[PDB]
Symmetry: D2
Subunit: 304 residues, 4 copies
Amino acid sequence: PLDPRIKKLLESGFVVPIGKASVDEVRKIFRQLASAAPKAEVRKVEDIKIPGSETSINARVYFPKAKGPYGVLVYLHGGGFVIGDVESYDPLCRAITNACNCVVVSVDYRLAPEYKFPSAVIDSFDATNWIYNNLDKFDGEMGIAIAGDSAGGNLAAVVALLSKGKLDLKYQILIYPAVGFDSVSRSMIEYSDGFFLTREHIEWFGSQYLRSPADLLDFRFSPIIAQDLSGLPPALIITAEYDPLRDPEEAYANRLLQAGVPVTSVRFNNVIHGFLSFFPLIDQGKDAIGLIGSVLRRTFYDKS
Amino acid sequence: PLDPRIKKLLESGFVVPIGKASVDEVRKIFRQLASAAPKAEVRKVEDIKIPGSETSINARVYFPKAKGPYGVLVYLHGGGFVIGDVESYDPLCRAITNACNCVVVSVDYRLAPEYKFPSAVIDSFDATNWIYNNLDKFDGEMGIAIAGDSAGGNLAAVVALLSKGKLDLKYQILIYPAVGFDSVSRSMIEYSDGFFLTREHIEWFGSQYLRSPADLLDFRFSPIIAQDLSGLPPALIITAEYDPLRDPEEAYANRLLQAGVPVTSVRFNNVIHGFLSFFPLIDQGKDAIGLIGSVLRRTFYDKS
Amino acid sequence: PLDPRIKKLLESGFVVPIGKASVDEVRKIFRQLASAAPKAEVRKVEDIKIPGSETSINARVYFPKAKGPYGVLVYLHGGGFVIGDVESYDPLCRAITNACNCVVVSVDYRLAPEYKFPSAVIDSFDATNWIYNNLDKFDGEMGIAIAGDSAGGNLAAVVALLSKGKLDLKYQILIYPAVGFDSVSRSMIEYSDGFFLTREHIEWFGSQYLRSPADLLDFRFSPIIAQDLSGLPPALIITAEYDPLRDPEEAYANRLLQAGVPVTSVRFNNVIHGFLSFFPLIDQGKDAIGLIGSVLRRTFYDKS
Amino acid sequence: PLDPRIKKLLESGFVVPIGKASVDEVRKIFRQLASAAPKAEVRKVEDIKIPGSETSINARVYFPKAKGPYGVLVYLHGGGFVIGDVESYDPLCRAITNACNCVVVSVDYRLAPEYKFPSAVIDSFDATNWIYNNLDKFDGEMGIAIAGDSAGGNLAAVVALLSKGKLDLKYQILIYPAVGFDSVSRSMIEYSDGFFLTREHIEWFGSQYLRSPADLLDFRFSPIIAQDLSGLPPALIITAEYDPLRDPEEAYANRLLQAGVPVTSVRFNNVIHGFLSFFPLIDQGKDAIGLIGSVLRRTFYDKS
């Protein structure tokens, strides 16, 4: 079952009313839930502007207390392509920075409904490309990895596909990613209601971001249908037991492994979608951050 | 685990080499596996020609020994839209006829690759419509129901959708139906190999029947994406534990139930896709036929 | 998920308050829930007294409208070894009689807490033995089979074990049986609350029937630990998707199959423990009765 | 499915022939598989003798390169209560030492069949008690935690129960622990063969360690039946997807959570029982060690 702490939380009015309030109001509610966590100190934080192909892309750079040289983690926030932003994810990014002893660059990709698919993908890819070619500005020569949660994990997976034979990503961290259109899985049907992220929210986010049903078949929305997954960076894929998105994420892990990509696929039992964002209230979220920290310290530094 | 009888069978060379032999050779091998079962006597068998909108449609009519009046079951064979035919399914149709005490009309819908989607759907619908308007010719006034296995179960489900507010179907029997595009489910990933129907076969059948990826999003191929499942006939949905197709079929059951359609969804444990076709070698197949017989005698006759 | 009809029912106060009211009151509430179903006509009903080794055993005999000769189904009711009786199960037994065209003998085995384990087992075995040696009194020469639901299914399975090389049982029908001590399965943990039969009820029933923890290891309470399951009668095992007892029943099916016993193991999706008792309110219960009818008409009569 | 790397490994003759070779030969084969991994440097290693209530208990103490003060992890090796020892687990203990920046004390508890249950429990508890009262000898004032894998994880869980209101354990790390008698779970039935640890091995180990079937009901063998799990130390429970032992471990996690104990329960997908012991050949094993390191650095030091 759910961790009783989580069951109590959901019963006690822990909700974002996606599809039942204006886009402004749902953004505001999410800001308050996410941005409430403590902001751990880091060494230095910098806001920068990345020159993207279609827009100037805001990003926030977090430097760790450890001395360089560093690896650089490009981080793409979640929020169903519609909500979230760099500043609401500041507590989570600072926690990751400290766990990984690495530079984290959190990207403000364009959001729907104002900017439809594939705008978020273009910005996420353009930001990763620029960071790769400018690692020297971050004392970042230990290399680049890409990470994101939920919608951001979808973007991370897709950027890893788009980067093949262009950039040299060390690693992809996919934190309960959306991996594409799912009208069929058991987890999607079983956990459609009552577990924080609902089927109605998933459909509402889709209705804002996608332009037509053809986009469902586009690998830049559904990377699980990509023709060829070989040669992608090694993956850590974190899933949550009581999450409608769980089964397709475990399928994507298996497909990567089948294509010879190294994958550590881990299900956090007893918890729900989005749990890292609520690490003060959901202890397992801290341990998932610690797991991200382990994998990145190993890839970048060959350290424990 | 698999029923040891089935494990022994698969180990002992029980295979159709889909995608690894010519269309002619795979059709021939399937004919031999299916057509090998005993042909139970029925009262009378008749081959008829149904005037379809695009072709003359062959069908075989089986009359039960019980006296009329009858319900009429329209039966659509499986074979991935490419293999099978009325004559290979003659043993299974005779078994159903005897179990249900009903008239069975088995439909020879056009096959791929010669005829692509949606030719099989058009023929299956046209046949059902004609049978409905001609029930009197079968002493068939107790009404019409639709059934099929695998690809035929897909066609049965889709005909039920297309019939809403045109015909009065009493019931839909979906025997491990294909219910649409699935790149994500656990059963599909878990049972992709070694359980008679493989992912490679599913992809090969798709490559023969579909015209483009857009067809994946067509409700006449993927009925699980239909906009509105309400008002469909009550369903019996039979699934098999070790079948890649299992999870999406259980999702379709749940979606029907959510739309207020009565559904009896039953998983036959320990068995594989296609098991009713092999009822002499797989005892559970006999019991699945007996379950079909119960549901149809109740719907048509209000008899035990 | 649950069939919405069932979810509505449970939400609407469908409960037996096991462990929270006196034994008299819980028996009375169960009588009212079970005995409410319509009593289908049969040909003749007779109450008899079977001379058991420890008690005179009441049984109710139901004769079908079909002409003889008959098979005889020994039926053992459920109720956690504590509640239920022949008369509350009269609607279900009449439904089975009509489905199977067979004689049903429903046994009033001694109940806990008045009579502890193994009293129910002794009576169930003694009744089966007497019926076997007296089949001629029922025009019952087509043979004997044993069936029960829940606690009664436990007793049926155990009688099948105790009968090996004494009686010639044709078949065992185990309808969501209790198959022994389970402190570990996923279904038990997952469906411990909210699905009609709860962990607290299971523990309360155990506390009334068992004498000490050693009884947990007795094969006459936990048949899944029996040393040797070979040579038992072919089984139909019915399970329900949302039932804490589900996983150990599927394990018992697998163990039988591994011991070379023919088993048809079927999970009724979307439904709860006890669903056949509520066949007027839960349509799938009718279809499960129809499946029992198919299997028994085949074993006894070699008829469809 | 299994990680293809693991499938290749198992196919390529990766086996301990438990129950099919002498106790000496199975011990020798395990020594060679486990002891083959690289021995990472640590600061200092010491072999000590702990005065137990029934025997002098050998233990190996590993000091980390980081400066003190330290927490102390008591480590209990796996091997089904029969095989393994401190020296075969030296590579894994050194890896843990480095990940946790902590003192690890690996305990040589008495083995079956020479010493039956509960000898291993008595030694594991006596060692933990002595280490707790002698933390000063290890510069170990940051406290004590207990960890073990498989049989050792069973012993760790049981020591945590036995320590309540005697010692102050900070944490219990249970790495695919055996949590007691399981004749019923789906994982046990499903993964009984072909996944390195088999049902036959589990039964053979039991037959060497236990004295009678009554021991199955003893909470010091089956901690999942303990009367009261409240007030135990926070747990990290690691399970593996393709492991017969998986389901009862997830049940034990849930029971702890229900008793208000903090638990992080994580399933490593695609891998088998014992995978941390094979961290050079199974990459996920390294990441599981990194997760142990995160949780211990947090509990002992409040560090990332």
